[PDB]
Design an enzyme around this catalytic site. Structure first.
Site, PDB file in Angstrom:
ATOM      1  N   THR B   1       0.793  -1.321  -0.032  1.00 51.24           N
ATOM      2  CA  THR B   1       0.412  -0.162  -0.370  1.00 51.24           C
ATOM      3  C   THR B   1       0.971   1.518  -0.141  1.00 51.24           C
ATOM      4  OG1 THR B   1      -1.575   1.321   1.102  1.00 51.24           O
ATOM      5  CG2 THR B   1      -0.289   0.445   2.543  1.00 51.24           C
ATOM      6  N   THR B   2      -0.217   2.806  -0.602  1.00 53.14           N
ATOM      7  CA  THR B   2       1.304   3.749  -0.163  1.00 53.14           C
ATOM      8  C   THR B   2       0.047   4.676   0.496  1.00 53.14           C
ATOM      9  OG1 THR B   2       2.618   5.413  -1.246  1.00 53.14           O
ATOM     10  CG2 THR B   2       1.424   4.574  -2.610  1.00 53.14           C
ATOM     11  N   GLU B  17      -3.404   4.732  -2.511  1.00 56.88           N
ATOM     12  CA  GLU B  17      -4.382   4.825  -3.643  1.00 56.88           C
ATOM     13  C   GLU B  17      -5.502   3.564  -3.029  1.00 56.88           C
ATOM     14  OE1 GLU B  17      -3.951   0.548  -3.318  1.00 56.88           O
ATOM     15  OE2 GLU B  17      -1.911   1.144  -1.600  1.00 56.88           O
ATOM     16  N   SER B 129       3.719  -0.210   1.966  1.00 57.95           N
ATOM     17  CA  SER B 129       4.474  -0.223   1.758  1.00 57.95           C
ATOM     18  C   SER B 129       5.300   0.288   0.547  1.00 57.95           C
ATOM     19  CB  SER B 129       4.524  -1.843   0.474  1.00 57.95           C
ATOM     20  OG  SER B 129       4.081  -2.461   1.818  1.00 57.95           O
ATOM     21  N   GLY B 130       4.798   1.303  -0.304  1.00 55.78           N
ATOM     22  CA  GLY B 130       5.104   1.879  -1.584  1.00 55.78           C
ATOM     23  C   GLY B 130       5.837   3.626  -0.895  1.00 55.78           C
TER      24      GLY B 130
END
Lengths: 226, 203, 226, 226, 226, 226, 226, 226, 203
Positions: B1-2, B17, B129-130
């Site tokens: 995710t980000t 997102e 995560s991003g």
């Protein structure tokens, strides 16, 4: 006077537990007796209105397949105490595997009644019961008292016709007796007392003989002995 | 995710997102990770889905009870402190979540709270995560003298780079600019598609 | 006056614990005495109706194979307290391996009675008991009081015939005595008091001699001494 | 009036704790005194009937091998409180390794009595005790009061002959005294009060001298000083 | 009227807490005063009989090496409350490393007294105390009240001679005073009140000067100022 | 009547909470008012004897560096409730990082007072307080009531001179006012009421202006406005 | 007399549970009856003002899709007890998978009422209910009593028109009856009693036939039978 | 008579809950009504002194952005109960995600009031409230009673002008009504009652229309309808 | 196992397979994994059997108590939020279950709740061991413009592909279409056999 929660008298009386005994004198009469190889319980059932579902109200209630109970007094206290007796019998089945003594079962219920005789902040159980059934020892017939007093009988009564029935039993009881003559003697006892409203009705009556399970009569069979 | 949260002059811009996995196996192509937590502040989600949604429900609850009792909005340091106390009262059965609350009370703020309850201000923050890709583009292109339109274009370029370079990130970006004048407003998806087609980030 | 829950008097009396003592004066009489190498307990048992299951009601109850108890007062409080004494003796068997002192056993039961003498929200135990049996020390005979007072005797009584029996024991007790003459002396004591209704009945009576376990008589043996 | 649970008076009195003090005035007399290198405790023991097991009833009771106690008042409250004192002394043996102060031991028991002086729903302890023994400090002699009041004496009394004995001690006590003349002075004190029923009896009496353990006299030795 | 558990009046009075204040008016008098660099506490000690162990009964009791207390009222409640103050000072030593404020210590004890002023089912603490000692702030002298009211003084009294002593202090107190003239002024205060039984006795008296620990006088030193 | 624990009236009154309000009418007077950019609190302080440590007794007490309180009524209940307010303000500092609303702080304390207004087994808090300080909203001035009733004022009073002071404030208060003329108006209010003993004294008085912390005056500054 | 918390009478009465029964006599009337293959419940609904949201107040309330209840007495106690019945039915759905007996459901609710009949510190439930529905056994119709007494009917009533309606049912009830003539008979019953204010209104009425779920009528359908 | 804690009457009354209803009759009047697509709440606000911070005291309080409440009776009980309603609405937001029924919310608060109607040791909540707002069902307007009784209205009142306002609403209410004419009708209702002190004032008034959030008027807008 | 839930225009279609294992060892050839949880919503089961059945009993209980007290059906977001709160109040003694609730209140919904209590809407969802096969065929063949018959044919083709390609999936497919007009109706097994014989998925 604080003669209204369970504490002692100016001379040796528990006034509240007395007052519970006159509450169970105001109830419906019921009795029981041993016979040759078992024990019976007959309740009067006086189905007053025609709207009451005659057979579905039961005052002879089963505690186990090998202990039964008929009650007298306040009917709500009766139902709660009978349910305590049922789950106590089930506790002894889980713990020991069988209900070897019915005296243990009446003693636990009577300890339950002694507590609410003993403590304040609560009234006694205004209810009296008789327990009947066979165990390893044999046929037993008990009684229970708003104090928790138990006594063992060959025949006893409870209710509005306590004294009249107990007088008839005191005269006319025979110890070893076939089942048919036993339920006939019990109905004569119930008659002599309750025939003051000049009616009896069909009563409800159950029996065990040692070895067998429980048999509560139907409506048709009791009228043959009536 | 980000997720991303950017503080500029008189506004704070947050966007996530929308992709939920929940497995390896990206399962939901349209999630919801950006939440309006009060009338002038919002919260993003970059951790475990269930724990994060329970945190969002509790913070909506406590901030609405706050606004009802005291009739004023809770300050941003106060909501992030409350969130830190909640995440740190239970840390040996912890919430595996990375939070990022942002809003405006008298000045635009965005705070970043980890799973152990450590809240710390920054002018731009990101979780997920991003996250390092959007920290790269924000480090290279961010300016405190930006407008709201240049800020939301920077945000969309950031999340687009994270979607291009990260597997757990993807889906349509939802962006919500919170300012004092207009309140919490979330941009419609047609406007975000228009900004993507203008910036040349569609393929 | 709040002279109806256990608090103190204008001069040094606990009125509720008094009122419990007059409750145990209203009970059935029972007594006990030591003999040469043991101790006996005789209860009067006055089986009133013929419907009572004569032998199965027992007021001499066993607490262990090496402590017995006969009780007087409210019979429900009696049964609950005797069951407490039984499980306390079993606790000492689990903890220490044997019941080395019977005085410890009467003291724990008496502490139990002192508590409900002490606290409000509850009445005292309206019951009195005597404990008898041998321990490592030897034959012991105790008494218990609604306050929890214990006293050790060579011979004592309890019940309706407290004072008459204690007067006969005060005159005619001999300390070292063979068992037969001991139960004869005990029956003479029970007679002189209870022969005011001009009847006694067959009483119930148990005995131990130091070394042996418990022996409760049967119906036939007591009538030889009657 | 709610002058029947422990609350305050129209002028500064706790009526229930008073009423407990007149309960301990109704008890059996007992006293104690220090001598040159120790302390004694003499109880009157008035063995009323001949059926009481004379020596086995003991009112001088040991709390440790290095603290003893004689009590007066309600005897059930006495036994419960003495057992509390025993287990408290054992707690201090577990925690600190020895009973270094006997004042700590009387203070914990007196805090126990202050609680039931303080709270409602319960009466005070209607009992008074005196503690005696040596510690690291030396011979100590305390007193205890139904409120929990403690006072330290060289000699004190308790019971029905409180005031008469305390008057004799107030006149005729000598501080440093050999043990024989000390127990003689104590018996003269017990005499002058209790010789109003024109009898004393053999009393019970114990002593310690600093360094030694506990010695309770036998029946034969006390009659030499009688 | 339920004016016998702590509830409000027809006009603004807590009758039980009043009744506790007249209980502390019935006590033994005691007082204290600051001097130039410290504070003293003098209790009257009126050793009534000769059998009381004169010096070993102490009413000036230490709470710490840097707070002391003398008490008046019910002496059992006094001892329990002083032990609470001691363990509270020890709690602050464990938690903060030192007893930096003595006002915190009197406030915790006074909160303890306010609770039993506030709740039913229990009476107030019928006791009053004054606390004295130096802290980081300097010499402090407090007072405590059965409601839990605290007030800070340069000099105060407590007990039977509350009002007479406070009148003498109200006239003749000088703020900065050397220790010798301070204990002389305190004894003159104790005299003028207590010389109505035409005797004073040797009183007990302690002092601190800021920097040093605690010094309680001996028997010989107080008679020089007497 | 059970008009002595908090239950309802024959017409809509809580008699105990009334009786607490007449308990706070018996207190010492105190008042407060907002001015142009802050709020003040002036207590009367009537230092009665010369032995009271004049400045060290404080009735304006700080709850935070950004909320203060002056109290009236039973002073022990006052101190306990003010300490509750202090630890509640500290709870909000731990939880939210700052004390954003002072109305939340008065509401929690008032809920604490409503509980002991609601439940039996305990009396109400017989104390009234006014809270003053700035928050994010601005200057606030509250009041508290033995029921827990809160009201917000521009100026209010409490104590013995409730009504006289509130009449003067009802006539002569101006909303936006510089600090000097504000404390002058407050002293004129305190004067007109308390000048019935024909004296006022130096009162105690604190102030905040929005932005700054707390300033309690010293002894010299208040006499310039006196 | 302590005839104001649930304890026994001078002759066998629970005065508080009586007083609850006259509280349910003061309620709104409601009744129910079995028909050929189901059971109905009709409440009177007397919508007094026009501002009441006529249909949204419901006194026939569903406990399950296969048990309903109409209540009479104190309406707040009614709502709390009906919610207890709902969550108890849901407990039996979780535990056993279905609601196999409706008698179990009325018995648990009645045990709940017996408890507050039994204990002090709380009044009984001043509410009466009738339960109706089909189970595995078939159509059942119960009643509940402020003591917790249950009775099973073919038809019963509750409320202000208890006795008048029960007299009409006692005369004119037919056991097996089609649904239309059943609701007509029920409305005639409700009429004869409630037509003493010379109005009835549209009542509310529900029905089940064995096999189907629950159907409560609408406003239009009941006026056809009216 | 024990008619001063919540137990039953000689005929079917809860005297304490009555006494709470006359406590809420002594309050400030407030009312509410539905209109065409929403509901309003108008409280009288009678700002008595000029020192009260007129707008900051609010009796229409928000429970959610989609339920509001105006209260009458004891204002402290009011504030505590409204805070319970707020946290209960927040519980339903956490548990179910939204507040789908406002009837559930009034029922939980009313169960809270029934408990303190049911149990002893505590008085009822002497407060009455009306709840208003839209849910999934639509506009709802409830009422609450010191027993916990709820009723749903199209328009209702509460307070000192209960009966006068309810008479005006009983005559002149129209069901579907635009918002402007609705608040005009509500003000005419508030006028006719409260214009007995020959003044009304500016009242406080809020409204919702289904779909929108909450709007409480300002000071200027209400005077246009005044 | 495999479950599926598809939202279309005015209906939501859910179906499971019926095979329980409980071992490796497929033990029950006719299980029950699709449950009617209220009058307009249902729940599928793809986890541990015992925990899943206890969850079904609790949700039937709470939703029936709901409908009885408030006399309206619970919304789908509300039942999935309640289910998330239940699964997340105990997550360190967790329920090893993958849930999927679907129904219609004013619009057809299907939510997917994992074992930690993360609820998220999607237009079609699936849980179970044979889930990626039905996600493949739903990704390739799903259309939001479908009718109820085309939707239930898509559902049967999906579960048929999962049965062909997965070991833990098998048995007869039971399908229940819930719409607003007809309520929760479950298709009889003869109709499902007819659809299989029409689509050519029988052998």
């Amino acid at each position: 006077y604080d003669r209204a929660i369970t504490v002692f008298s100016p001379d040796g009386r528990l006034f509240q537990v007395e007052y519970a005994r006159e509450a169970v004198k105001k109830g419906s009469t019921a009795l029981g007796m041993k016979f040759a190889n078992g024990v019976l319980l007959i309740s009067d059932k006086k189905v007053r209105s025609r709207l009451i579902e005659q057979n579905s109200i039961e005052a002879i209630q089963l505690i186990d397949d090998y202990v039964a109970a008929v009650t007298s007094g306040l009917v709500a206290d009766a139902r709660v105490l009978v349910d305590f007796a049922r789950i106590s019998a089930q506790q002894e089945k889980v713990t020991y595997g069988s209900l070897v003594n019915i005296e243990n079962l009446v003693k636990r219920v009577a300890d339950q009644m002694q507590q609410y005789t003993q403590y304040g902040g609560v009234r006694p159980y205004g209810v009296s019961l008789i327990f009947a059934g066979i165990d390893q020892i044999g046929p037993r017939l008990f009684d229970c008292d708003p104090a928790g007093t138990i006594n063992e009988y060959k025949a006893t009564a409870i209710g509005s016709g306590k004294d009249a029935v107990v007088s008839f039993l005191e005269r006319e009881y025979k110890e070893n007796l076939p089942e048919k003559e036993a339920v006939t003697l019990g109905i004569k006892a119930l008659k002599s007392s309750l025939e003051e409203g000049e009616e009896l009705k069909a009563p409800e009556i159950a029996s065990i003989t040692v070895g067998n399970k429980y048999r509560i009569y139907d409506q048709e069979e009791v009228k043959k002995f009536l | 995710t980000t997720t991303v949260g950017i503080t500029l002059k008189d506004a704070v811009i947050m966007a996530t997102e929308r992709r939920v996995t929940m497995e390896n196996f990206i399962m939901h192509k349209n999630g919801k990770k950006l939440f309006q937590i009060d009338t002038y502040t919002g919260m993003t989600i970059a951790g475990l889905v269930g724990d994060a949604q329970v945190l969002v429900r509790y913070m909506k609850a406590e901030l609405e009870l706050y606004r009802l009792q005291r009739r004023v909005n809770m300050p941003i340091e106060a909501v992030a402190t409350l969130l830190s106390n909640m995440l740190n009262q239970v840390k040996y059965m912890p919430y595996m979540v990375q939070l990022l609350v942002g809003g405006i009370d008298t000045a635009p703020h965005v705070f970043s709270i980890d799973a152990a309850g450590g809240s710390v201000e920054d002018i731009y923050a990101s979780t997920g995560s991003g996250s390092p890709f959007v920290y790269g583009v924000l480090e290279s292109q961010y300016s405190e003298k930006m407008t709201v339109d240049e800020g939301v274009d920077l945000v969309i370029r950031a999340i687009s780079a994270a979607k291009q370079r990260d597997s757990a990130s993807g889906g349509m970006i939802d962006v919500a600019v919170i300012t004092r004048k207009d309140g919490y407003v979330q941009l419609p998806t047609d406007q975000i598609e228009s900004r993507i087609r203008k910036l040349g980030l569609i393929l």
